[PDB]
Design a protein around this ligand. Structure first.
Ligand SMILES: [Zn+2]
Ligand SMILES: [Zn+2]
Ligand SMILES: [Zn+2]
Lengths: 576, 199, 47, 99, 281, 198, 159
RNA sequence: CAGAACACCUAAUUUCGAAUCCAGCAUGAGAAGC
RNA sequence: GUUAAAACUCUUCUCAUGCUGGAUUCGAAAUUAGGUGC
């Protein structure tokens, strides 16, 4: 059972409450904005109170449209646990702090900072392909190419397998993997979000205009969003050599860009190998305080100002755009510009003297043919596709094409098979005895989890079937045991280290790779690793070989399965 | 007889709150993780005994006032049946008129129960000898109970309210000496009809 | 359970005024038909 | 009135316990005793079959069930034990439905 | 839910272009097929195929048969493609060969007490996903559940405790106990019966543990009288009375001595002693 | 009968660090601070008072030389026959004095600040380690009571002696670094146990 | 025929009839009567087959005397004896692991997880009492379930 | 297609997370109708 | 084709009352906001 709490235009509340038999699952506890209007918050609270006590709040990505009502759902104490991906968790740390910061500047409050940290106490995190067993439901995440940490949620209940798509990323995405990862198994229901734009890589055109303008004697101001989009246009400046410099005048946008480069393992495979080489190179020069911002705005030698206030509404893109609006320069609108925003008036002339060019390649969501392609990759045809968000218009034309593919649509304003994931026994039942007033029978066999049916089949069945039929390093199991024992005796590997590495391994393999890479990262300004220093009389060459031994020993343990890692690590640390 | 007192008791938590897990299987399941589990339900909610705390409170204060109240806290002590607390909470002959429920929490463990660390500082070297992890209930956690007196006289309101004030003084359950269990109570009392449910 | 029982058992081997009063107590059910039957059974057994 | 038959067995709903008696002055456990209890959230079924029904048997049985919800059912009712909630599915039946 | 045998359908309990409304039932021509509608389903029993048939208007379930191209042509040209098709009434290998092609058009097939897994590992060997497991099948009165040797270990240990704490060494089987006259036994057990140290439960438990031999009674009276090292508490009921602390101990000692002296009396004699106190046994 | 109220007031004179004990409060503050302060869910700072008082009384009374057990060695069982066992508890009787926690009268924002500490290399005289903690500022006021159930004669003076030991030596953590030096103001009253009985 | 595979020690005397409380497995093999050991070995043998396809000795009286002495100083409490009964009943490798767990001097703290002795003893002898406790409770694992229960219900009845 | 506001470098790490007491009493074993 | 055959040992009555998982034990032990520039 699924409820769409405000799933029409995500203004004043949006949630997907999966009503399974044991849990009140919530997907995408988020809010949009109308850029100006007070009673809004009362309709939000009424929706939130109507949700009820949600057993698990699951965030497909980290935008406020998907994660904006989460600390309000902790203030009313309706949320139990907050599961997402780790990059999503730190992104909503910055986004909830910024949301409240604007409420304080708006003179407000929907939630408070205590609600934010109280959200991040109950916030469990798992990465892609990590099935976790919560309250009759096996929940897995799969990448959907939208932003860093964005996934689609796969919930296998006994009443059906649901795939909340979230936002599917476009083909113009360079930082992420392009093919959106999917369940290998069934999808009884797919909760799909429609598009917002229209169907074309301008890309190079950016580097064209910014060429011609910078040689003309004018800096290029590129307004952008702070989630992904600034890093998209900075990555297109990182790829092709642009001889004049780039400058980020965005504090939040810069610390999100750093948050890209510690979480490079969650980005595209071709960029996961980025070796003590930065991915954005060292081409980006970051403005830190307001005084370099003022000096750079006053400075007039042509250079990219590539920063993020969004849509010319408040931030440091503003302090640049005032003198640029007084100027040879140009504004490059690589994002959509919403209603009632000052930059929409700049994009509609109502007059910026410097040149107006918008670019439509840098889009976050996908296309109509990409939502079709998202649909056709599926191993089985879905039973029903619940188009939920988008503009109403393109929801109708996508709905018409997906009816043409002869799969069924439920629009939210226009919104009954039972799918029992049955368990059945295929073994002899007659030969049973009694010991403690229990009709029992010892049996040995094979459980076979087949799509839509868990069966318990004998040795005869397995006979019939068998008769018919990252780039992690590698080292042997005994070498792993020897090296962990030796680094434990010299106090490099500790019980807090093994506990924390176990927490990131139960988090998922790529989070543990990030943890060991972050610990073994020598800071070039100091020379310090986060490894525990060893006890003894080791010199600096030997201390460096032991740190590399710890790096290559906690890697290549990651490659093993969970049980093997627990059986190795339970000897050195008896508590997990 | 024809009337019956309903005392809706709303308890807020001020200091941390501990009440130990009483079920064997639930406790031994939690002793792989925490050494002092909070007394919890199977619906994931915090269960606190409330009748014995009220009886102990009223017993101590009525004994200090000078009333002829038996001490049922002594080991296998028989209640006589003529005390005020025998009429309220119970005697051997007759049951109590007051049927106190457990303080059922209004939230569900994962929002109010936290795993904490307590120690034993060695007094001369100022290091930690023992380290034990115990579960506790956060402050501001809301608990609900109802006290249903079957045959009300006039004192059964004020005696319960006085015992509640004593529970604000000494604490409701668990480690009352280390400062745990300090709570406040709000009382909504009504005298219902016994024949209310008969249509 | 058998042997436990059978060892247990084994150890376990080792004039008008009365008319008016009985007519009163028959109506308020103090003495009853079972009481009359068992009291008469005790009298028929002896004294 | 049928017995309240649970749908689970002992290892799922019956838990042993530790109930105490605390001295009022010394604040120490004078007595300890173990006692089984059925857990919260455990559900039970009972079928009440009324032959020769009047109009008011439904109302009286539901009213009795709200009184049982208020008081409790079973033992240790003063300590908070046995407080439950009832759901009722009523159905009229011709007695010859087995024929 | 279809139960295969013909074709039974349990919603109304029917078993397989105007519309007859029983469960909306409507017979389309095969060139005949029947389309049944219910709140939980839109089932289609097609029958056999011949070339331009009359497919219904959403056929949630499509129960067809074949023994090859025409089956798939009919699998298409049906608006809102079915959730699950069912391949019946044919040879098994040809059904699988057709079924591979219904999987290639991404449509799920199934070739022809509730049971609960209380299990927990996985393996991807061969075409199917699995987890090797040796276990137990309990057949409770409305469930059939699956367990492993940890649950058998727990009920085996419960049976071992329940069967060990059930037979003592020399009970009901065949010296140096205290001695005291019958008159002092009368006076002591009267006095210890008015105040409640010797109560009817305790006299009855003395009677069962005396019927189970003298040594069982000696063991029972010792473990009743045994003062704990830690609490300093004996398993007697407290006397009801002023008795301050030392005649408490002398009074429990009197109960100890009186019961232990009554032990060597004859079984009929201790019976004539006890029934004045506890009429039952 | 009577019971004794000891209303205890602490004013912080040097930055006070007691550590957060709740695991959910501590591993969610680890991205910010390496040493969180103990807080309530009402966001007021909690200090454990009992163990400090009992440790104080064991140290001072053992130095004076009476029969007082130690409850600080490994699994140290209390005896039951001393002044500390009578006041603060044992394996037999409970503690006659219920010592409430020390909750601050102000919430975290006014009184908790987020400070940076360092480890300086003794040779190069440069910053070798850096870690962030939380400290309670000076002048923050914490309120407790101490209730004595069966009040004996010496008990107020005994509690105040322990409250002078805690003023000199300190309460909380980082005690030898200067953290935790406090001042106590005590108002005492003897009350009857039948006071709420109208 | 039928073969019992159990040593008939721990046989009580109920009246004039010798008696044993026992749990087992009828095997239609020689109609054998096999204990729980049999089941554990054959369970693990089928586990290995399924997955493949895809102690020092002390005298009894010394055990009573040492467990007596360690009970009086409260090194071996009834919590320890109860949990040792749980870990022995679960198996022997579990009892080995539990006893090594409570006897392991932690290298960072220097503390054994036993209960400290009651009374004045030198730290060397307190350690020797700990090593004695390791030796008896490890030596207890070499015996069967019946003598272990009969040994430790004199000290913790309910264990 | 949503948040956005004189200078660096850092902000990690390590131990423990157990031990013990108690688990008893007491009452009631009948009626009555057919 | 049995001194046959016919007739339910049925109805009424809650294992309920009394008893707080309490007591013992301080998240503290280590680490200079230091290095730069009149
Ligand atoms: Zn998005
Ligand atoms: Zn009384
Ligand atoms: Zn002492």
């Amino acid at each position: 059972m699924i409820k769409f709490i405000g799933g029409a235009s995500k203004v004043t509340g949006s949630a997907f409450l999966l009503e399974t038999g044991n849990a009140k699952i919530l997907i995408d506890c988020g809010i949009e904005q109308e850029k100006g209007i007070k009673d809004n918050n009362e309709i939000i609270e009424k929706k939130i109170n109507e949700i009820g006590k949600a057993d698990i709040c699951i965030l497909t990505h980290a935008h406020l449209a998907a994660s904006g009502l989460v600390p309000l759902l902790v203030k009313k104490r309706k949320v139990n646990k907050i599961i997402s991906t780790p990059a999503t968790k730190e992104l909503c740390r910055l986004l909830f702090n910024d949301f409240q910061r604007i409420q304080e500047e708006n003179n407000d409050p929907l939630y408070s900072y205590d609600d934010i940290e109280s959200s991040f106490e109950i916030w469990d995190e798992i990465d892609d392909r990590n099935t976790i067993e919560l309250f009759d439901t096996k929940i897995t995440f799969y990448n959907n190419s939208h932003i860093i940490g964005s996934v689609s949620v796969f919930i296998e209940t006994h009443n059906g397998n649901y795939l909340f798509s979230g936002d599917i990323g476009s083909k113009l995405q360079q930082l992420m993997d392009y093919p959106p990862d999917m369940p290998d198994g069934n999808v009884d229901y797919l909760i799909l979000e429609s598009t917002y734009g229209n169907k074309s890589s301008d890309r190079d055109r950016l580097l064209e205009i910014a060429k011609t303008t910078c040689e003309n004697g004018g800096k290029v101001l590129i307004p952008s969003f702070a989630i992904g989009r600034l890093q998209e246009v900075l990555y297109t400046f990182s790829n092709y050599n642009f001889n004049f410099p780039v400058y980020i005048d965005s504090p939040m946008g810069s610390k999100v860009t750093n948050l890209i480069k510690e979480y490079n393992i969650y980005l595209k495979k071709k960029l996961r190998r980025l070796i003590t080489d930065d991915l954005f190179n060292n081409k980006y020069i970051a403005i830190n305080t307001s005084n370099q911002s003022k000096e750079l705005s006053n400075s007039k030698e042509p250079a990219v100002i590539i920063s993020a206030s969004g849509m010319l509404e408040g931030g440091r893109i503003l302090n640049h755009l005032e003198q640029i609006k007084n100027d040879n320069s140009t504004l490059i609108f690589v994002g959509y510009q919403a209603q009632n925003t000052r930059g929409r008036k700049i994009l509609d002339g109502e007059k910026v003297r410097c040149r107006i060019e918008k670019l439509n390649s840098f889009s976050a969501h996908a296309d109509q043919d990409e939502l079709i392609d998202y649909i056709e990759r599926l191993k089985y045809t879905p039973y029903k596709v619940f188009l939920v968000h988008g503009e109403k218009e393109q929801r109708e034309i996508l709905a018409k094409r997906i009816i043409s593919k002869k799969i069924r649509v439920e629009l939210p304003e226009n919104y009954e098979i039972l799918i029992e994931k049955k368990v059945v026994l295929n073994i002899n039942t007659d030969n049973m005895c009694n010991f403690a007033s229990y009709r029992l029978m010892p049996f040995s066999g094979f459980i076979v989890e087949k799509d839509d049916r868990i069966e318990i089949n004998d040795k005869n069945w397995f006979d019939m079937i068998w008769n018919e039929e990252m780039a992690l390093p590698d080292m042997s199991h005994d070498k792993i045991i020897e090296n962990i024992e030796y680094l434990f005796n010299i106090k490099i590997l500790s019980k807090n280290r093994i506990k924390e590495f176990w927490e990131e391994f139960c988090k998922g393999q790529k989070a543990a790779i990030k943890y060991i890479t972050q610990v073994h990262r020598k800071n070039p300004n100091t020379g310090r690793r986060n490894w525990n220093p060893p006890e003894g009389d080791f010199t600096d060459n030997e201390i460096e070989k032991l740190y590399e031994t710890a790096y290559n020993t906690l890697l290549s343990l990651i490659k093993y399965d969970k049980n093997k890692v627990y059986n190795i690590l339970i000897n050195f640390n008896p508590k997990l | 007889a024809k009337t019956m007192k309903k005392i809706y008791v709303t308890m807020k938590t001020l200091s941390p709150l501990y009440t130990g897990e009483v079920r064997r299987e639930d406790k031994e399941a939690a002793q792989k993780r925490v050494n002092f589990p909070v007394r919890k339900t199977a619906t994931n909610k915090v269960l606190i005994p409330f009748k014995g705390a009220l009886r102990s409170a009223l017993e101590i204060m009525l004994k200090a006032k000078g009333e002829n109240v038996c001490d049922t806290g002594e080991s296998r002590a028989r209640p006589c049946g003529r005390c005020v607390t025998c009429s309220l909470f119970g005697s051997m002959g007759r049951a109590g008129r007051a049927s106190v429920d457990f303080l059922i929490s209004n939230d569900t463990k994962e929002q109010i129960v936290r795993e904490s660390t307590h120690l034993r500082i060695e007094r001369q070297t100022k290091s930690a000898s023992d380290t034990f992890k115990g579960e506790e209930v956060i402050e501001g956690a809301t608990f609900t109970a109802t006290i249903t007196i079957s045959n009300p006289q006039e004192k059964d309101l004020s005696l319960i309210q006085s015992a509640l004030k004593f529970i604000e003084e000494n604490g409701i359950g668990g480690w009352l000496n280390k400062g745990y269990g300090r709570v406040s109570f709000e009382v909504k009392s009504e005298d219902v009809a016994t024949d209310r449910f008969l249509k | 359970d058998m042997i436990w029982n059978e060892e247990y058992n084994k150890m376990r081997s080792q004039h008008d005024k009365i008319i008016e009063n009985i007519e009163y107590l028959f109506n308020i059910k103090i003495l009853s038909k079972n009481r009359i039957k068992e009291f008469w059974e005790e009298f028929c057994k002896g004294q």
